[PDB]
Design a protein around this ligand. Structure first.
Ligand SMILES: [Cl-]
Lengths: 241, 231, 244, 111, 195, 240, 250, 235, 243
């Protein structure tokens, strides 16, 4: 059964290597979440540093692709960094060629197209990663677009990825059923970050210290990650309410 | 078993069987010995014939005026690798007016052998080499294995029954390392070393091959009546 | 490496046959039958469309019969997509010859080159062969009217009457029975339709499941005309011979 | 425009006896009206009892001598230390020179 | 090289080509045959750059002979001329173009007609009743404009050709050492030995 | 580029793809070559499961490589066209550089070399073809007959056959061909060739092709009636 | 390194089947239903927008795509494969036609080029076939309106009306009862919506249905005025609101 | 399947070992070296009596001072010979001298391992290379598809090799005359051949300093065959 | 199954078994470590003395990249040399285009992407080494460890090879007992102790110790080998602690 080793069709029209690459996605046992405000797009991810010998500042799954675009990865770090370097190079070339910053959705489509090729070409394996791209696009506004090893991509009101993604997804669905809107109706990004952590806490049923989390924030003209103390400041604000 | 089809495959315990099978070709090869003092480095090799009508397969190859090696295993692979060394020594002379350090010669062979162990379609080299030389830091002896592993030694031996000579040299270490300024004695020690690897056969005049390089001696090979002195 | 997944498309069986060519011929034997009949005053091409649906657009359709130049046409049996690749090559080859020599390409020369391309895919390159058999119908001023067939092996032969695709064994026996050398085009039209009608896997032969073409000198003086039949014209010719 | 050639002057001379041969050359090296060196040898022992000089444009002269010296080395490597006879050296040097037929070594060569 | 002429009459094509090969101040040869038979009923004469001429001629000859063996058939003069034109039209934009001018005289056996084509090194083809390459045309065209008739016999054509050679031997600066004359008709190609 | 080594050695020292290419030859229609005192004759079987053929246009079994040399074959028809084309191109190239047509030995040596190349090149299978190559060297009247096969080996034969049931016709030729006295005339050579095919063929109708090559580019193919006269004559002498 | 897969991955089996093509068609069978209907003065192509999550914005995922101003495409099967095929199809309409003739290709020829691309994925080294069937609707001056189906093999067929994917068998039968050669574009849109409701299970509105037409020229969608011969695209995507208007008089 | 350049667990290359089996199926070739010259002899082995035996060419000239005999898949030898001839002539062009026999042999052996995934498989033919040069005199070399070559005083290759080699071990001495070597090749060929040895199914050749490489006529070999039969009966 | 016979193939778990098999080759190798300190990094490795005939100090295993980075590895030694050769090429091209010597994080990703690339195709084999490397740049000291999968992180301390667990435990004690930081000269001594303690898992053959370091104050930010008096002092400190 060599149809399970390379990306050719099985008798039932399936691609097992693509399916198994989806399972590699959860190998890190980390959950991520993205939401949109009025002015911003917040992405949060769990940070698990098991070894005491690790330098915790170097353990990250959130990447600054360009000044405006951020990307969080679900999957092994080697494949994650492979995707990040390509995304950075693609976004840099787009700007040079076309005279304006690559939109989040266009970079998503491009990375999704590359992923599609690995599902059709035999010599290249799929990357065992799911890529969530975030920005505040100058035309479309706050944006979340997500890519997988199948080459699928779509825009989101909000999204979650990881082993316990379904719990977080329904939690978010139930909030947007209630609020009746497409986003978090909040002025500051600080409170949208707070919303994100609050609804992750409820869905996962765990408490977080400042070193159990990782936060990326996209605003107009810049995407940035938060320090441990920025997150601690945010954790204190949630606790005092 | 299922993991020995090519060099590009690791076994479940992390072994490369094609590299190990290449190592096996060396073990079937005729014994060759290497040893050095502080002034000279000496190769001794037992040559092998097909029958009494044939010549004896030459084991020693000159690389430069200050460097050369002996071989055990696939002889064409030794020709490829010696030719590469000849070029690398040559490049160093023409471009930098510099005699190639025996150590660099080792690093270059290591990296050439390695590339043949990580790509599809290729195969590992099937030969072991003992490189002797005299450069700006004195006399040297190196052992090349086609796994890529190169090792600097006072003395050593590779091939069938090489363990006898390797044990002898390990005992004789303190004696032969201080045979300075005396070529014929360093050779005598190497000829006695290779004698610990003989079975049913003894060293004859068209059987023994000796090479020497040192302080005031270019790399030169002795065959035929020129080795009769040492039997 | 990748050796593991190589089918080795261009090797011999122990019996000295080419696996992939044999299996491609097996594929072609399920395609709709196509018949070519060569008369003294023209050639008939007749082919059966593969099981039609009532909502198929029949007039703006082409599946079996293709024009290579003004003097040569082909009937196709096999994968249509494979056939179009080869048809475009053949069309270009014809124009190359016309550009080089200022004369229309002799039929056999075109047939040989197309057959040579097929041959290549069976000897080198590790690719699957083209799953196509052609019936070539054409005219040139050296041999006049000519019918040829080529198959996935790249072997080609000349015919007075021939069939490709499904039920060739039964079709050939029927053609061998009623064909004679002094035959005219209108007789050949009838034979072609009668043979398909008897060999068809359908209930009854109708206009919407057929493609039809003639190559006559039935233009005005010493020149050749290609007539790819319209739906209504096939409906009429089917009534004129009393099949419907 | 860049001119890839120069003239380094000097002169050389070869005479053959019954059981010997001499190859002489002055040691002066020049460009235009200046002296670069009063002692820059351009006659060389190339091994196998062959002496060689390539006089004219010194950069080409040195390159050729360098290539022929290297040729003698590889002749030994490839043909069991066989001595390169003077006639075989001559033929080899022809191919060294003619190989740059359309961008010549600007030298008069004597061995 | 230098002088090549061609006349198409009722039943044949006649080619006349100068015999001299001159290099510098020396006539190296006075019996040179500046022609190749491409097929039994097709002959090509050539003039132009030294080396180029024979190299091109023999290359065309090899290709037409290859075609003949492959198809067991002789290409028409029109078809051969179009092949030759295209080869020269390719050549003119190459790194080093063939500097060769040709005349092609053939008898079409399907049409039972003689045919003469003039093609220059650029690949400029024309069918003509009479043709010339180089400075020869400057004397022969006007002469033939006067004396040529479309219904002439092979003998009349040869006399008409004698008149051209005579004019060239009177007014041309160089000694071209006479011509080799060849006739192409229904029976193929033959050489007139006494001209 | 497709690189796979398709022709390789097996443990017993055989190259199976070359040996299987010989099986394709064994399946092909029988071909026979017989050389006389002043000629070579090439005879070829044509199978009769194909009625309604057009023999004007169908590829002939014997091909002219040049005006003085011919090539017949047994095996895959499509494969043979590639060998014939290359041979014809080399024929013209030889005339161009050497200013002399090929010898039959040289043309054969070239064809065999091509076949050999396809037995140790990556990504290709061997030719499923064996050839009989016959003719006369330029300005020579000594008859030449050579045989090639998929491996690449070639040799000269007084008479030889290839294809299906070739072992039966070789048997016939081995007792009916005298080396001391080859068929002294064209008629004798054509007859011995037709006789040898009649051991294997069936009806001597449109099943046998005969081509006669004489010195100085004298090649002609016999028609049905001409061959049928040999068939008729041989059968009447047989009833004895 | 380098693509060592220079050999075919789709080959003939002893029975004559091309395995990978068959299996690709199986993938198309699993795909969501899409359909096309040809009227006298236009063509409609439609499909269900199967949402992957209610947090996903299904407007950002377009299943019906413009190829040229007069040609549109829809599919059944694997989305990613379709997306890259649309990219390639849009480019080939320019490189192999518009950049040569200064006008857009007729439907049959663009279809022919897409079919070629899909055929090559069936024969070339180291690739699997595309896992999609396409329905391409379009108009051109000399052929009028047309509708084509392109399969994984590279085969294409012209249709009066058809469906592909999940419930294609039932949908085709529904279309046979309703189609006549006098259908006006609005009648064809009505039948398209009726046929799609049978195969759709959940919500059936303008947000879960994607539908586009090939009809009259739309000068208001051109973006400029002043050239009389340029009159606007015949391809138009119906809005979510335009679909709901027609779902009341259903 | 498996890679073409794969090692066995015993440290040998599968394809090289398998090509050695192909050579054992080949026709016998024998070479003997003397101080008066080197003799090369082969069994022709025609597959059928209708085949004209003089067209079987298993002894071949490389240069005036170097000759060659073959055994195994002989079609494989053509490009080896073509390379050998070009190597020999090229060396003469570059150095205005004859190329050493050992240098020629090493050049041919360089082609041998140039296979893999270069040609698709090793050569299926072994070569006996015999010649003379001024440095090392008369020489005989056995060139294998492994890329290895040994110098031999005498050597047999092909189907009858191991029996013929054992015979050569007893017969060879350092004082053999050329005539003695000629007879010895005929004698040992007659022993290992299937069909009865004559001038039509066996071929002799030699290389001498004075006259170079010569293939013998069928008339010349026939007399040596007659001289051999008479000498064996004479005791 | 058969999922483990070819590199770049996902198993049904989502794993690349060939990489996991390369990890087994690393676990078989000798012990090597890295200790990050106040203003630099220290590297040490265990060199098994197979025979008396090995020339002491003359089979050097720690390698320099550029002039400011040091690299040590466990597993298939030739594979490690290949990785360093690439590392040197990457560093040279960075210095060529950007003038400044390559930063350590930048250098870490260069090796990472290159090793990750050898998990993408079936025509190459994964690297049979884990590599500990680091140095000093404009932002201070950095220590990294890179594995066959291409995975790497920054480390306070790092260990790989047959005695990795023993060495890791010893490293964790230093991190706990020195929250403010360890000095370069102290870290050299500690490296010697840890290699001697990690030698217990390989105690048949006795060994030779090799240490190197980069420190802003002690070596001026350049990579240097520890030799002579400083080495013997570090050896003695280690000998005192095992008894
Ligand atoms: Cl793209």
């Amino acid at each position: 059964g060599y149809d399970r080793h390379i990306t050719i069709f099985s008798p039932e029209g399936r691609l097992y290597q693509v399916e198994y690459a989806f399972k590699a996605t959860n190998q890190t046992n980390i959950n991520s979440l993205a939401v949109r405000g009025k002015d911003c797009t917040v992405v949060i991810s769990q940070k698990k540093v098991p070894d005491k010998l690790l330098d915790p500042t170097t353990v990250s799954y959130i990447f600054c692709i360009s000044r405006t675009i951020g990307m969080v990865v679900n999957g092994p770090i080697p494949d994650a960094r492979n995707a990040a370097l390509r995304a950075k190079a693609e976004a840099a070339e787009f700007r040079y060629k076309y005279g304006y910053d690559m939109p989040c959705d266009v970079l998503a489509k491009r990375m999704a197209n590359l992923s599609q090729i690995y599902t059709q070409r035999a010599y290249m394996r799929p990357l065992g990663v799911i890529l969530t791209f975030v920005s505040v696009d100058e035309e479309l506004g706050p944006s979340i677009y997500k890519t997988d090893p199948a080459g699928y991509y779509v825009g989101y009101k909000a999204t979650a990825t990881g082993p316990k993604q379904q719990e977080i997804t329904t939690n978010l669905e139930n909030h947007f059923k209630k609020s009746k809107i497409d986003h978090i109706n909040e002025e500051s990004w600080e409170k949208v970050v707070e919303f994100a952590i609050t609804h992750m806490i409820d869905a996962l049923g765990t408490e977080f210290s400042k070193n159990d989390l990782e936060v990326g924030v996209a605003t107009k003209d810049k995407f940035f990650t938060l320090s441990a103390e920025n997150i601690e400041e945010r954790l204190v604000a949630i606790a005092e309410q | 078993n299922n993991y020995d089809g090519d060099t590009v495959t690791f076994s479940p315990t992390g072994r490369l069987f094609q590299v190990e099978y290449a190592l096996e070709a060396i073990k079937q090869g005729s014994v060759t010995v290497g040893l050095r003092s502080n002034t000279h480095a000496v190769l001794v090799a037992l040559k092998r014939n097909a029958d009494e009508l044939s010549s004896y397969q030459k084991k020693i190859i000159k690389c430069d005026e200050h460097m050369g090696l002996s071989l055990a295993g696939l002889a064409p692979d030794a020709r490829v690798l010696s030719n590469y060394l000849r070029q690398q020594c040559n490049y160093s002379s023409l471009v930098f007016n510099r005699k190639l350090a025996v150590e660099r010669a080792g690093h270059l062979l290591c990296d050439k052998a390695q590339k043949n162990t990580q790509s599809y379609g290729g195969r590992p080299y099937g030969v072991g080499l003992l490189i002797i030389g005299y450069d700006k830091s004195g006399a040297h002896l190196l052992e090349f294995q086609p796994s890529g592993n190169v090792t600097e030694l006072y003395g050593t031996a590779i091939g069938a029954r090489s363990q006898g000579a390797k044990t002898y040299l390990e005992r004789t270490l303190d004696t032969f390392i201080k045979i300075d300024g005396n070529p014929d004695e360093l050779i005598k020690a190497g000829v006695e070393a290779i004698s610990q690897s003989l079975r049913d056969e003894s060293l004859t005049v068209d059987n023994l091959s000796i090479a020497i390089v040192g302080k005031d001696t270019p790399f030169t090979i002795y065959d035929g009546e020129a080795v009769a002195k040492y039997i | 490496g990748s050796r593991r997944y190589d089918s080795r498309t261009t090797i011999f069986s122990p019996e000295g046959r080419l696996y992939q060519v044999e299996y491609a011929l097996e594929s072609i034997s399920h395609a709709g039958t196509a018949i070519g009949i060569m008369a003294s005053d023209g050639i008939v091409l007749a082919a059966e469309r593969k099981v039609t649906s009532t909502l198929l657009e029949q007039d703006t359709s082409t599946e079996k019969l293709y024009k290579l130049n003004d003097k040569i046409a082909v009937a196709v049996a096999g994968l249509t997509a494979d056939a179009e690749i080869l048809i475009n090559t053949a069309r270009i080859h014809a124009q190359n010859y016309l550009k080089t020599y200022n004369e229309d390409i002799p039929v056999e020369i075109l047939v040989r080159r197309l057959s040579d391309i097929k041959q290549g895919y069976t000897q080198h390159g590790g690719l699957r062969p083209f799953g196509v058999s052609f019936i070539y119908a054409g005219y040139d001023d050296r041999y006049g009217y000519q019918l040829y067939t080529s198959n996935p092996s790249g072997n080609y032969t000349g015919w007075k009457a021939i069939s490709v695709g499904a039920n060739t064994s039964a079709a050939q026996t029927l053609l061998q029975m009623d064909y004679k050398d002094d035959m005219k085009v209108d007789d050949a039209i009838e034979l072609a339709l009668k043979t398909l009608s008897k060999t068809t896997d359908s209930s009854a032969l109708t206009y919407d499941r057929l493609e039809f073409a003639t190559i006559r000198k039935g233009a005005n003086d010493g020149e050749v005309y290609q007539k790819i039949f319209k739906p209504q014209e096939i409906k009429d010719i089917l009534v004129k011979t009393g099949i419907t | 425009q860049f001119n890839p050639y120069g003239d380094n002057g000097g002169t050389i001379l070869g005479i053959a006896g019954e059981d010997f041969a001499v190859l002489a050359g002055d040691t002066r090296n020049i460009t235009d009206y200046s002296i670069n060196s009063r002692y820059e040898p351009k006659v060389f022992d190339c091994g196998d009892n062959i002496v060689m000089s390539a006089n004219g444009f010194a950069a080409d002269g040195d390159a050729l001598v360098k290539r022929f010296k290297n040729s003698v080395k590889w002749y030994h490597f490839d043909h069991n230390d066989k001595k390169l006879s003077i006639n075989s050296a001559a033929r080899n040097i022809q191919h060294l020179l003619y190989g740059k037929r359309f961008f010549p070594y600007y030298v008069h060569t004597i061995i | 090289m230098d002088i090549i002429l061609g006349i198409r009459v009722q039943d044949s094509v006649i080619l006349a080509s100068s015999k001299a090969v001159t290099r510098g101040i020396s006539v190296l040869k006075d019996s040179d045959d500046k022609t190749r038979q491409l097929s039994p009923h097709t002959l090509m004469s050539f003039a132009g750059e030294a080396g180029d001429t024979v190299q091109f001629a023999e290359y065309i000859q090899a290709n037409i002979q290859l075609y003949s063996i492959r198809e067991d058939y002789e290409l028409s003069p029109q078809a051969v001329s179009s092949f030759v034109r295209q080869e020269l039209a390719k050549s003119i934009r190459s790194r080093r173009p063939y500097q060769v001018n040709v005349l092609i005289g053939g008898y079409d056996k399907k049409k039972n007609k003689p045919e003469l084509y003039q093609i220059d090194y650029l690949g400029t083809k024309v069918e003509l009743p009479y043709g010339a390459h180089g400075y020869s045309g400057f004397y022969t065209f006007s002469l033939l404009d006067h004396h040529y008739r479309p219904d002439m016999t092979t003998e009349e054509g040869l006399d008409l050709l004698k008149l051209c050679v005579q004019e060239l031997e009177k007014r041309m600066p160089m000694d071209f050492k006479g011509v080799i004359v060849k006739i192409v008709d229904k029976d193929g190609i033959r050489q007139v030995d006494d001209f | 580029g497709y690189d796979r080594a398709l022709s390789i050695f097996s443990p017993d020292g055989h190259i199976f793809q070359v040996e299987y290419a010989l099986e394709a030859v064994k399946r092909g229609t029988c071909a026979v070559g017989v050389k006389g005192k002043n000629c070579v004759v090439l005879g070829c079987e044509r199978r009769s499961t194909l009625k309604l053929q057009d023999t004007r246009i169908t590829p002939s079994k014997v091909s002219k490589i040049d005006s003085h040399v011919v090539l017949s074959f047994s095996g895959l028809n499509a494969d043979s066209r590639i060998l014939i084309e290359k041979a014809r191109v080399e024929a013209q190239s030889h005339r161009l550089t050497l200013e002399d047509p090929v010898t039959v030995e040289y043309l054969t040596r070239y064809v065999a070399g091509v076949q050999q190349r396809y037995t140790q090149s990556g990504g290709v299978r061997p030719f499923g073809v064996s050839t009989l190559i016959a003719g006369f060297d330029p300005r020579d009247d000594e008859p030449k007959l050579y045989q090639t096969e998929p491996s690449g080996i070639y040799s000269s034969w007084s008479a030889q056959t290839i294809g299906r049931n070739s072992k039966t016709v070789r048997e016939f030729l081995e007792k009916n061909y005298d080396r001391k006295e080859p068929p002294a005339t064209v008629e004798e050579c054509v007859k011995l060739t037709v006789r040898s095919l009649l051991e294997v063929v069936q009806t001597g109708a449109k099943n046998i092709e005969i081509t006669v090559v004489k010195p100085d580019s004298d090649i002609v193919a016999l028609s049905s009636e001409e061959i049928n006269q040999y068939v008729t004559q041989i059968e009447q002498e047989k009833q004895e | 390194m380098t693509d060592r897969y220079s050999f075919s991955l789709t080959t003939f089996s002893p029975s004559g089947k091309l395995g990978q093509i068959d299996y690709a068609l199986t993938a198309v069978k699993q795909g969501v239903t899409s359909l096309g209907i040809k009227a006298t003065n236009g063509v409609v192509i439609a499909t269900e927008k199967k949402s992957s999550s209610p947090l996903a914005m299904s407007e950002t995922l377009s299943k019906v795509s413009l190829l040229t101003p007069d040609i549109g495409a829809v599919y059944s099967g694997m989305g990613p494969d379709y997306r890259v095929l649309v990219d390639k199809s849009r480019k080939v309409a320019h490189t192999s036609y518009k950049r040569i003739y200064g006008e857009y290709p007729p439907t049959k020829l663009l279809v022919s080029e897409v079919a070629k691309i899909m055929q090559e994925a069936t024969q070339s080294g180291g690739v699997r076939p595309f896992g999609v069937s396409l329905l391409i609707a379009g108009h051109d001056e000399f052929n009028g309106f047309s509708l084509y189906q392109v399969d994984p093999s590279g085969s294409y067929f012209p249709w009066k009306a058809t469906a592909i994917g999940k419930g294609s068998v039932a949908a085709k039968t529904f279309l046979e009862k309703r189609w006549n050669d006098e259908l006006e574009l609005e009648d064809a849109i009505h039948i398209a919506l009726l046929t799609l409701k049978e195969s759709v299970e959940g919500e059936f509105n303008g947000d879960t249905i994607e539908l586009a037409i090939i009809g009259d020229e739309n000068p208001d969608l051109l973006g400029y005025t002043g050239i009389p011969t340029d009159k606007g695209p015949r391809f138009r995507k119906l809005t979510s609101q335009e679909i709901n208007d027609r779902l009341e008089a259903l | 399947d498996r890679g073409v350049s794969t090692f066995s667990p015993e440290g040998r290359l599968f394809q090289v070992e398998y090509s050695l089996e192909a050579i054992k199926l080949g026709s016998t070739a024998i070479g003997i070296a003397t101080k008066e010259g080197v003799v090369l002899g082969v069994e022709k082995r025609a597959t059928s009596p209708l085949l004209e035996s003089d067209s079987i060419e298993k002894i071949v000239e490389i240069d005036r001072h170097i000759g060659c005999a073959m055994s195994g898949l002989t079609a494989d030898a053509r490009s080896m010979i073509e390379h050998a001839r070009t190597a020999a002539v090229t060396h003469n062009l570059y150095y205005d001298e004859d190329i050493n026999v050992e240098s020629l042999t090493q050049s041919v052996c360089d082609l041998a391992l140039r296979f893999g995934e270069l040609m698709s498989r090793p050569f299926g033919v072994a070569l006996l290379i015999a010649g003379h040069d001024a440095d090392d005199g008369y020489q005989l070399f056995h060139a294998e598809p492994s890329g290895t070559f040994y110098r031999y005083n005498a050597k047999a290759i092909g189907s009858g090799s191991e029996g013929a080699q054992a015979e050569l071990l007893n017969e060879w001495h350092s004082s053999l005359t050329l005539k003695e070597a000629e007879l010895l090749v005929l004698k040992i060929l007659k022993q290992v051949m299937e069909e009865k040895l004559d001038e039509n199914n066996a071929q002799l050749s030699c290389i001498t300093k004075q006259d170079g490489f010569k293939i013998y006529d069928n008339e010349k070999t026939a007399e040596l065959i007659k001289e051999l039969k008479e000498k064996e009966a004479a005791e | 199954t058969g999922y483990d016979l070819s590199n770049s193939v996902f198993s049904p778990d989502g794993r690349n078994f060939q990489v996991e098999y390369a990890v087994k080759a690393v676990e078989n190798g000798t012990t090597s470590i890295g200790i990050k300190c106040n203003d630099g990094v220290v590297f040490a490795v265990e060199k098994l003395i197979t025979s008396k005939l090995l020339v002491p100090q003359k089979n050097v295993k720690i390698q320099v990249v550029d002039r400011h980075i040091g690299c040590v590895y466990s597993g298939l030694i030739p594979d490690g040399r290949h990785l360093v050769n690439r590392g040197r090429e990457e560093a040279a091209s960075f210095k060529k285009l950007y003038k400044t010597p390559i930063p350590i994080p930048a250098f870490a990703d260069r090796l990472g992407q290159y090793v990750q690339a050898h998990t993408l195709y079936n025509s190459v084999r994964p690297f049979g080494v884990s590599t500990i490397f680091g140095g000093v740049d404009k932002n201070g000291a950095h220590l990294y460890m890179l594995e066959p999968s291409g995975s790497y992180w920054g480390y306070k301390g790092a260990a790989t090879g047959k005695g990795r667990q023993s060495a890791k435990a010893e490293l964790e004690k230093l991190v706990d007992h020195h929250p403010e930081g360890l000095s370069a000269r102290e870290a050299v001594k500690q490296a010697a102790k840890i290699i001697y303690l990690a030698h217990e898992d390989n105690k048949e053959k006795d060994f030779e110790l090799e240490i190197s370091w980069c420190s802003l104050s002690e070596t001026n930010g350049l990579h240097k080998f520890v030799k002579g008096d400083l080495l013997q002092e570090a050896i003695d400190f280690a000998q005192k602690e095992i008894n």
